[PDB]
């Protein structure tokens, strides 16, 4: 279960054989015909692919350095990359002859996503959400209540996104035979890592072939956001191998690298092993979590990706970080100068990739990924600024 | 690595502090044939609400690491028995698997569970723990393949540790019981969430070499504080009869 | 100017220059190469066209009836048909050599998407609407804002749209010299009512285009809600040739035709002069303007465009009409069902789809026009359900 | 249809009653050499906000098409001064052209101006309103061309209404100088006026007629059923008497 040293299935025996199972049949899936011909079949009629390749002319310009492109997933069905990879288990999970779907939410971004798939494959939904949570998101639950999907509050502990996990599995563990656990990241134990960035990969391969048939070239620099990871894993994969093309991974940088208020795992964690997988987390002097913070709440999380540490580490990829400051100046910017409102997640890359453009060349290609429409944030902005 | 018809003792490390711990661990100690101290995680998996609860006290009252072996160590300064620690794998692997093990054993450890870190993944651990003189631990679930409950026997130096899926015992953890014992060289102690005397009975006579209990204990510690030692023994004497 | 003998150009002399420059311009630039280079360049890559046709499989099966195809308008960028025409005269405008773009908005959806094109290409955007849909409006008018637009609240008379829409008015005849006025809808006085359905008409082309791949033909019948008019029209146009195609409009039934709280113009209304043009109107025994309702704001019209008015004349195009009750059952039904959430205008188009669907052969074909997203509806619906 | 330099008031119809309506006309007579009366619609195109709200106001009082003609017939029991009836053309077209007409003539209505029906569109109009006897009235803005001006005159009965594009407009007298260098018909100007320095520049510049609605209209929404008296004090000032 590997990349490189990180990786792995670090869980108690009783989540072994689910997960074994899965590993199964994702194997004899990935690439049956019939399998991928529906998933193509559902990714465009339904899910709207391929999104556009949008040329940020005017922000380019205002700027005076590189010209930046973005990789619209904000128009996606749902507003978000998440869609592709929700769609691509459900799918999974239908195929393997499960009839229910269950999985765990905080902002309730991935609670809505799984939602809508299990509604469009007609399976059985039940998300579980911390009590806090529920009471935070109350547009969200009405929203995957109106899906079909039942919305379990928790309110063991601290009635918060752990809490609710922790019942996610428990859950499992007892009726994985008809049930699946629908992941929302490039986290978790194998296969989860990897089986979620195989259904993001999309995401770079049209881009690939835009890019090319706009600029008759590869890019310079692809940006992309980092949270647990899996938009930015999307986008980078398949340029793994185009030497040329630079990867950039932006962490959030909160209030400062220099004030604990952030969620930089791979710019200021150690490595180590929580939530089934050996990576970068954010922790404490005994090896404890620590508590992590961002303007964007999928971008608040204490670890990262197997992958993504893998690629810190061979150096094929470069993680920087952005505050929630300046993230916010990129919302606006953004909105005011391309009349694209974008999420505060995606506005981070948006917001790496403007200071990173002014120093290069006005003939070089920067395409940074849009992963999601900033409609969900108004609110969170509305109130600062 | 107990006496067969053992009862075990579960209490997590520092909760609510590291000395009442020790108290609860001498008070209990006459009724146990074995004991399994669980070492504060911030993050533990489907570990269930008793005892994740357990852990978010020990830690929030600023639990550390070096209190764990302090515990066990000063409890050897009266006792003798068996002591199995029960971590995740982030501790030991932050300390260095070997330093880990070694501080273990010189601690007054017998046997250690890591809870998270699958079987065919403990090759190097088994290893280095007989080198350092620490029996291991594995568990099975009622999930868990006939194929690997062989594997997994095989690697255990201390006891086979059997866990419910989920106060009836499930007809699930009795079928699981029953393989194990017919498929096992090791010993096997069975946690399937005992409450009240009738448990223990049946598993016992069921075969089970040993019976944990925790969460019945815990959710007491929870309720009394320090103040819980008398209650502990009253349930433990329950228990045994 | 005429369609049939609805339409017209009825308006005060001082709005005719700006109308006459108006015509004159968009004859120019209707058939020229570069604006529509442009046009579809924007529409593609900005706006996200084409937009997909989605077969409701499993809507179809639980009615047992004809099949349903859906055109998915709530996928295109702001979750709405509205961004085509927005993008459609703004570029016009920019050709024109126009600075300045303004607009009034009620519920706010006309006076974001317009927002969002000034933004694109770079125009000064001034809104006006009623203070009272001001104060209502609380989340559009920050999202106009956050595009750059200026909102300009209107205090005279009843603070509404129709006190919104003078201020416009007057804006215009003063300034068109260097500021263009963006019609929202099939309606006013000539040249908008045809401009803006050439502008949606893209709609129908994707959607006939779709149709024959999927079906090798045809379908037996489109069916589109109407409001002012602008999406039904826009989806209708491109098969009004096609003499084997069935139209049908689905107007606001409200709270019942027989109840005086809808907003059917075509179904119960009189043919009148008003907004600069001949049309059918719902009228006083007075011929004065009568109150109108509608759970869906964008249905709540006492008008409708003067081409589905000479449609329905000729009988070539046939308009029903949907209770509140109805379209918001169809709303939950979608959601439940096929995994969207549409907007509750769209709604009422789905809802009479529904019922006529069960009336026909499983081997017939019905296309809907979802015309936009149901995000925006949340609050209204989460209140009454 | 009214005598050089004269001074032509402007009310709607029932704002705020149609008896009050009746009042202001027989007060304001005396200085009036010609009225224009305002019908109420629900949807004024850029009418200007003064005259705007009037409307709603009158029909939020339910005002109701018969009434306009009763003012008018009953401010005929004691004057002659002719009077310009203002309408939209849905009203007239919902009732049928001639019919409208001919009521209005009956009524002792002697000219009328139908604000949004283009001069292009008022053929068949300007024929049946001659058959009835009623004068026609079209407007000409600054940002109407010498083409369509003259075109608006030679369907003018009655006489050509200037308005300026919103200290008078400098556009405002250019639209006179070439209006009166070009019209067969007297033309009357609806500029705006609010002091007597605009009465008398604008006569002096050929203006045949100048009209005042807004300066009145905005004491009668001020004042309701009382203006009567300081809509005298305003006209006076106007006159300059
Ligand atoms: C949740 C979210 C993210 C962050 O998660 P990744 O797994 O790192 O992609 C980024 N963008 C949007 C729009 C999101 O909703
Ligand atoms: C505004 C709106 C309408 C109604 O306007 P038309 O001009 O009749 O199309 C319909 N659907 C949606 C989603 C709208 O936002």
Same mark, same amino acid.
């Given at each position: 279960?590997?990349?490189?040293?990180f990786?792995?299935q670090?869980?108690?025996?009783?989540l072994?054989?689910?997960?074994?199972?899965?590993?199964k049949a994702?194997?004899?899936?990935?690439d049956?015909?019939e399998?991928?011909?529906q998933?193509?079949?559902?990714?465009?009629?339904?899910?709207?692919?391929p999104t556009?390749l949008?040329?940020?002319?005017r922000?380019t310009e205002?700027?005076?350095?590189?010209?930046?492109?973005?990789?619209?997933?904000?128009?996606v069905?749902?507003?978000?990359?998440?869609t592709?990879?929700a769609?691509?288990?459900?799918?999974?999970?239908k195929?393997?002859g499960?009839?229910?779907?269950?999985?765990?939410?905080?902002?309730?971004?991935?609670?809505?996503?799984?939602?809508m798939?299990?509604?469009?494959?007609g399976?059985?939904?039940?998300?579980?959400?911390?009590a806090?949570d529920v009471?935070?998101?109350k547009?969200?639950?009405?929203?995957?209540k109106?899906?079909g999907?039942?919305?379990?509050?928790?309110?063991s502990g601290?009635?918060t996104?752990k809490?609710?996990?922790?019942?996610?599995?428990?859950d499992?563990?007892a009726?994985?035979?008809?049930?699946?656990?629908?992941?929302?990241?490039?986290v978790?134990?194998?296969?989860?890592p990897?089986?979620?960035?195989?259904?993001?990969?999309v995401?770079?391969?049209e881009?690939?072939?835009?890019?090319?048939?706009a600029?008759?070239?590869?890019?310079?620099?692809?940006?992309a956001?980092?949270?647990?990871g899996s938009?930015a894993?999307?986008?980078?994969?398949?340029?793994?191998?185009?030497?040329?093309?630079?990867?950039?991974?932006?962490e959030?940088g909160?209030?400062?690298?220099?004030?604990?208020?952030?969620?930089?795992?791979?710019?200021?964690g150690?490595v180590?092993?929580?939530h089934?997988m050996?990576?970068?987390?954010l922790?404490?002097?005994?090896?404890?979590?620590?508590?992590t913070?961002?303007?964007?709440?999928?971008?608040?999380?204490?670890?990262?990706?197997?992958?993504?540490?893998?690629?810190k580490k061979?150096?094929?990829?470069?993680?920087?970080?952005?505050?929630?400051?300046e =993230?916010? +100046?990129?919302?606006?910017?953004? $909105? @005011?100068? /391309?009349? *694209? %409102?974008?999420? &505060?997640?995606?506005?981070?890359?948006?917001?790496? =990739?403007? +200071?990173?453009?002014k120093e290069? $060349? @006005?003939? /070089?290609? *920067? %395409?940074?990924? &849009?992963?999601?429409?900033?409609?969900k944030?108004?609110?969170?902005?509305?109130?600062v600024? | 690595?107990?006496?067969?018809?053992?009862?075990?003792?579960?209490?997590?490390?520092?909760?609510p502090?590291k000395?009442?711990?020790?108290?609860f661990?001498?008070?209990?100690?006459?009724?146990?044939?074995?004991?399994?101290?669980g070492?504060?995680?911030?993050?533990?998996?489907?570990?269930?609400?008793?005892?994740q609860?357990?852990?978010?006290?020990?830690?929030?009252?600023g639990?550390?690491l070096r209190?764990?072996?302090?515990?066990?160590?000063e409890?050897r300064r009266?006792?003798?028995?068996?002591?199995?620690?029960?971590?995740?794998?982030?501790?030991?692997?932050?300390?260095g698997?070997?330093?880990?093990?070694?501080?273990?054993?010189?601690?007054?450890?017998?046997?250690?569970?890591?809870?998270?870190?699958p079987?065919?993944?403990?090759?190097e651990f088994?290893?280095?723990?007989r080198?350092?003189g620490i029996?291991?631990v594995?568990?099975?679930?009622?999930?868990?393949?006939?194929?690997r409950?062989?594997?997994?026997?095989?690697?255990?130096?201390?006891?086979?540790?059997l866990?419910?899926?989920?106060?009836?015992?499930?007809?699930?953890?009795?079928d699981?019981?029953?393989?194990?014992?017919?498929?096992?060289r090791?010993?096997?102690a069975?946690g399937?969430?005992?409450?009240?005397?009738?448990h223990?009975?049946?598993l016992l006579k069921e075969?089970?070499?040993?019976?944990?209990?925790?969460?019945?204990?815990?959710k007491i510690?929870?309720?009394?504080?320090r103040e819980?030692?008398?209650?502990l023994?009253?349930?433990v004497?329950?228990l045994?009869?």
């Open positions: 279960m590997w990349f490189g040293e990786g792995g670090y869980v108690p025996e009783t072994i054989e689910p997960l074994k199972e899965l590993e994702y194997k004899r899936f990935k049956d015909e399998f991928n011909r998933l193509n079949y559902y990714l465009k009629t339904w899910a709207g692919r556009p949008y040329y940020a002319k922000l205002k700027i005076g350095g590189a010209k930046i492109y973005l990789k619209r997933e904000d128009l069905h749902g507003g978000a990359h998440k592709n990879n769609i691509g288990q459900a799918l999974l999970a195929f393997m499960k009839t229910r779907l269950i999985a765990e939410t905080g902002a309730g971004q991935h609670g809505v996503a799984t939602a798939a299990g509604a469009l494959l399976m059985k939904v039940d998300i579980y959400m911390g806090e009471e935070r998101q547009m969200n639950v009405f929203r995957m109106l899906l999907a039942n919305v379990i509050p928790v309110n601290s009635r996104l809490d609710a996990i922790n019942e996610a599995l428990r499992w563990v009726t994985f035979e008809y049930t699946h656990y629908l992941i929302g990241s490039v978790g134990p194998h296969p989860y990897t089986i979620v960035r195989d259904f993001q990969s995401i770079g391969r881009a690939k072939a835009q890019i090319l048939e600029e008759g070239q590869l890019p310079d620099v692809i940006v956001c980092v949270g647990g938009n894993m999307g986008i980078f994969y398949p340029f793994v191998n185009d030497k040329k093309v630079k990867l950039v991974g932006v959030a909160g209030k400062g690298l220099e004030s604990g208020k952030h969620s930089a795992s791979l710019n200021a150690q180590g092993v929580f089934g050996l990576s970068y987390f922790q404490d002097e005994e090896g404890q979590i620590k508590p913070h961002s303007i964007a709440p999928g971008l608040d999380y204490p670890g990262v990706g197997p992958e993504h540490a893998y690629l061979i150096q094929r990829a470069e993680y920087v970080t952005v505050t929630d400051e =993230a916010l +100046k990129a919302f606006h910017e953004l $909105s @005011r100068t /391309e009349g *694209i %409102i974008p999420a &505060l997640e995606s506005a981070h890359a948006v917001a790496y =990739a403007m +200071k990173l453009a290069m $060349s @006005r003939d /070089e290609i *920067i %395409i940074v990924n &849009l992963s999601g429409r900033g409609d944030d108004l609110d969170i902005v509305l109130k600024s | 690595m107990f006496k067969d018809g053992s009862l075990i003792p579960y209490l997590t490390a520092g909760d502090d000395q009442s711990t020790l108290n661990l001498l008070a209990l100690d006459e009724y146990a044939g074995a004991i399994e101290l070492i504060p995680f911030s993050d533990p998996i489907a570990d269930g609400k008793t005892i609860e357990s852990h978010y006290r020990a830690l929030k009252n639990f550390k209190e764990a072996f302090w515990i066990v160590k409890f009266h006792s003798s028995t068996p002591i199995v620690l029960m971590t995740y794998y982030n501790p030991i692997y932050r300390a698997v070997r330093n880990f093990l070694a501080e273990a054993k010189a601690s007054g450890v017998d046997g250690i569970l890591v809870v998270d870190l079987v065919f993944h403990a090759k088994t290893e280095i723990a080198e350092e029996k291991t594995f568990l099975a679930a009622p999930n868990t393949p006939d194929e409950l062989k594997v997994i026997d095989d690697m255990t130096t201390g006891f086979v540790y866990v419910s899926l989920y106060e009836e015992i499930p007809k699930t953890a009795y699981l019981l029953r393989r194990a014992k017919r498929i096992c090791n010993k096997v069975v399937f969430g005992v409450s009240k005397r009738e223990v009975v049946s075969g089970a070499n040993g019976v944990v209990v925790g969460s019945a204990l815990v510690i929870g309720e009394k504080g819980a030692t008398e209650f023994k009253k349930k004497e329950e045994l009869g």
